[PDB]
TrEMBL record, chain A:
InterPro entries membership: V-ATPase_116kDa_su, V-type_ATPase_116kDa_su_euka
Compartments (UniProt record): Membrane
Annotated TM spans: 361-385, 406-423, 488-511, 523-543, 575-593, 654-675
One Gene Ontology term from the biological process aspect of the record: vacuolar acidification
Name of protein: V-type proton ATPase subunit a
Organism, scientific name: Citrus clementina (Clementine)
Role according to the record: Essential component of the vacuolar proton pump (V-ATPase), a multimeric enzyme that catalyzes the translocation of protons across the membranes. Required for assembly and activity of the V-ATPase.
Amino acid sequence: PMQLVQIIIPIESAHLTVSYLGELGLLQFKDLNSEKSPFQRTYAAQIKKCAEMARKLRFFKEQMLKAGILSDLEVKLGDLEAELVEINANGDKLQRAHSELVEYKLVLQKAGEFFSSALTSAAAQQKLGFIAGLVPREKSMSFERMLFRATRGNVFLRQAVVDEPVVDPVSGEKMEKNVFVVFYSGERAKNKILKICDAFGANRYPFNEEFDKQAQAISEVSGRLSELKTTLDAGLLHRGNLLQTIGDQFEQWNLLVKREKSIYHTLNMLSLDVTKKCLVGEGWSPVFATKQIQDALERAAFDSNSQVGAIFQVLHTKESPPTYFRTNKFTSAFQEIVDAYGVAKYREANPGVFTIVTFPFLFAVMFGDWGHGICLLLGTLVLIVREKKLASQKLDDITDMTFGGRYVILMMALFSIYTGLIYNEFFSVPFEIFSHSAYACRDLSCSEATTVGLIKVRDTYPFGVDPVWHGSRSELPFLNSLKMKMSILLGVAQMNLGIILSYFNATFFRIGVNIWCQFIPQIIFLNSLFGYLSLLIILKWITGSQADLYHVMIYMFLSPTDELGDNQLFPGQKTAQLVLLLLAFVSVPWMLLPKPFILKMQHHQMIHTIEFVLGAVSNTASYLRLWALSLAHSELSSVFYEKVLLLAWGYNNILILIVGIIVFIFATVGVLLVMETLSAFLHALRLHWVEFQNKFYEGDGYKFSPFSFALLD
Amino acid sequence: KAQAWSDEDLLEGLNQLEEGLKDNIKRLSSFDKYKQEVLLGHLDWSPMHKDPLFWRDNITNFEENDFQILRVLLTILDTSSDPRALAVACFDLSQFIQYHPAGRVIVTDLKAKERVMKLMNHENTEVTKSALLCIQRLFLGAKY
C-alpha cells in the first residue's frame, strides 16, 4: 500500500531529516546523480571525505582489534591511532636496540671470560692479526668445515657456552649463537675469516686488548639495553592506557561512521535543486505511513531552527514501488518464504499469511513423530524464551535461520502433535487411548489373527486410527492405501484453495470480464476433474467395497470410454461421468482461447498450454510424496521399536539393556529429528512452492526499500 | 570545504581568508624565531616547533645567544604557568632534540626530561602523550 513521493528540502534541514530517518526511514532516493556522474556526483566530494574518514576508522578498528580494546572527531581518532602506532614503533626500535646491546654485552663477556684460555692457546700453538668475533654454536660445524686450511692448526677459536640463546644484533627473538675468538695470519685469510664471521650472524662485538675494558663495555651495553627496554615498556603501557579509551571511542565511532556514510550515500544518490535552493528528493515510502513524515520534517526544521519549511508531496507515476506487508515476529518466516517464492505486486495477493499455517498443515500431514517432535518443539520454545541471549549470542549458520524461523517451526511442531495424535504413534509407538486397548478383536477367541473371521473392531479408537486396523502386522497395506487416498483428497483441496486464491486476486485486479474469461476456465476444470475421483473415494468409503481396496477408483477410471461401469456406486455415475468428460474436453480450449481472443478484440497461453495437466500431475505427485513420507516415517518408527524391543528382551542384566536403549535412542533421534525431519520439511516446502506457483502472484516484484540503517536496524 | 556555499562571494572570501592566514603565519614565524611566547611567559604549541627544520632554526636563533632562549624554554618546560604551556614546551623540546642533538643534552641538563616523563604517567592524557613523545626522543639518544 505504498506510493512514490517527491519533495524539495533545504540541504541544512535535509541533514537533520536524513539523520532522523537513517535508522528506519520511509523513502529511499534513486541514484540520479550517480547515474549522471559517478565522478564528484553532487556531494561526492563529501562522500569521498566520508570515505577517507571511514578508512581511517577501519584502520583504527583493526588496530584496536589487534590491541584488544573494547570495539574533527575523525581527525582526532586518526591522530590518536598515529600516536599509538608511533609509540609501538618506538618500542620495537628500543627492543631491537636492547637486543643489539645484549649481543654486544654477551660477546664482550664471553671474550673476557675466555681471555685466559685464548692466552693459553696462543702460548701453546705459537706481527699477529686479530680475528675477534663470534661463531654460532649451532653453526660450529660449518665454521670449522669452512676455511679449515686458513686455521692451519695454529689457530684455535674459544667458542662461548651459549647455553642461553644469545640475542642477535638485529633480531630481538634471539638465537643459540656462541662467540669465538680466533687468530688471524695472512691478509686474505683474515679477510675470509671476517667475511665468514659476518655471514655467521652470531652475536659479535669487537674484543678489546684488555679484558677489563671488554667487561666494562659489556656492562655498559647491558645497562643501555635495560634502560631502552624500560623506556619502551613505559611507552607501551602509556599507549595501551590511552588505547582503552581510544577503543571505546572507536566502538562508538562504528555507529557514528555508519550514520555518516549512510547520509553521504543518500546525498550522493539524491539530486539537489539549485533554483529552489532545496535538495530534491524522490523515494519509495509507505504511502499509509508517509503521513508521519510531517513529524520528522518538523523535528528537522525546529532543530535546525530555519524558518524555511520543506514541502513533502507524492507524485503519481506508472512505476510501481516495491512494497512489503508489515511482518510481526511470527509473520517474518512467512514473509521470508514468500520472498523465496519471488515477490508479488502490492495489489497482487500474497498467500504468505495463509501458507504460514498451510505449510505446517501439509508438513503435519506429511509426517510427524509424537515423541521427538514434542521434544523438538520444547527445544524450540526454550530457544524462543532464551532469544534474549540469542540476540546477544550470535548464531552460526543454520542456527541463524532457526532463530528467524522459530515461530514457524513451533507452529509446524504444534500441527505435527495433532498429526501424531491421529497417527497414534506416541513417541513413535502406538499407545492405547481411553480403553485398556484402543482396538481389539471381537469374537474369534481361539481363531488366529490370520483367519476368515480374523479380528472384529467392536470398539474403534475415537481419537485416532484403530491400532488393530492400522498399526498391526498385516494391517499395513490397507492403511497405506487409505493414507494415499486421503493424500489425494488433500492435494485436491490444495488445488481448490489455489483456484480460490486466484479468483480472489483476480477480483482484486478488478477486470471487468477478463477474470471470467481467464481464471474461471483455468480454475474449476481440473478441480472438478480431480473432484470426480475424490467424490468416488467418498462414495467408496460409504459403500465400503473390500476386494478392490483403494483401487476401485483406478478400476473405474481405467475405462475412459463409455459403457460398462458396473462398479459405479452412484446409479447414474456412468452417463454422468461421460458427460463430465465431455464437459472437461469442451472446457480445455476455454482455458486457453477466450483471453487471447478478448485481447485481440481490444487491440502466456503457450505456457498455460499443458500447464493444467502438468499441475494436476504435480498435485498427484505431492500427494504420493506425502503418502510415501508417512510410510517411511512409520517404517522408521517400527525399526526403532523393534531395536528397542530386541535390546530390552535379550538383556537380563541392566547394563546390556541400558547400552542398547541408549544406542537405539541416539540412532532414532539422528534418523528422525534430523534426517527425516529435514527431508519432510524440504518436501513440504517444495510442494508448497508448487501449489503457490500454481495459485498466483507469479513472482514479478521486489522488496520494500527504506533508507534504514542496517547496523541500527 | 565541508559546507559548500552557493555564493561565489563566499569562495572569494575564503581565498582572502586563506591569504590573510598565510600573511599572519609569515608574521608569526618571526615571533616563533624570536621566542615571543617565551618572552611573554605563556607558551602554546608553536607551528615552528612542530616543524623540525623550523624548530632547529628557532633553536639556532636561541643558540645565537648560547641557547639562552632555549635555556628559558627548557626552564619553562621544567615549570610552566599553564598545563598547556608545559605540554607545548615538552613537544617543542622533543622536536628540537630530534632535529638537533644539542637540544636533548640541554633538556637533560635542565632535568626537565624527568619532570616530563613523570607528567606522562600523570593526568592530561594529551600532555601525557606529548611527554611520552619527549621521553621517546630522549631515550632514542639514550639507547645504545
